């Protein structure tokens, strides 16, 4: 359910 990128990726 989590996913995407971010500033951690």
């Amino acid at each position, epitope marked *: *359910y*989590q*996913l*995407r*990128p*971010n500033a*951690e*990726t």
Partner: antibody
Amino acid sequence: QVQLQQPGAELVKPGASVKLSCKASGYTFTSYWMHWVKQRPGRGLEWIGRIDPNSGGTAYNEKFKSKATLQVDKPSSTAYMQLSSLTSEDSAVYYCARYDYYGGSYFDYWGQGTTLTVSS
Amino acid sequence: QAVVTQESALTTSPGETVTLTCRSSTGAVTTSNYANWVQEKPDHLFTGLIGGTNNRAPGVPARFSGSLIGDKAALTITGGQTEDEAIYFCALWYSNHWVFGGGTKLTVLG
């Protein structure tokens, strides 16, 4: 010539803790993230977390934040991961894998893994 | 684990095209899952091949490509080689962590 070197094996007793090493060579240590993955031939690979040697920037798998600690030593170009309060469930092969993050997003080179055996 | 799943095992022959897939239990594999494909050959020799869904890792044969197919990530091997017999791992990104698949053992009749 990109190389990651990890000790072959380590024996420890339950309750102890270890400091696994990953010597990096063949590239600029600071411009690549370093990841650690745990493998228990049995139920696959698990991502432990990542550390940015350049900024010390750290990222842990929730399931491993109280178990592992990542750091590096720039002069020696080697990444370390200390595991604490060892148990049999910690027995496994531990890999360090180099990671590029830019307009990229990869895992290129992998050390050959240190198989840790936690047994009394 | 957050649960990525792959074909248990597959078999191809030198020169053929074989495609490996990767499922996310949450839903359709997306560009934001930054699909990674890793290869493991005898004696824990792991090599990254594909990252960010279709970016080929430098120093990787051109016959390896990555993409999406339906609601899954795909690793395509065109013109398969004998040396491609190995185990292939999928890895998806879920906001704050990587999740690997069980790995597909690929046999290249050589």
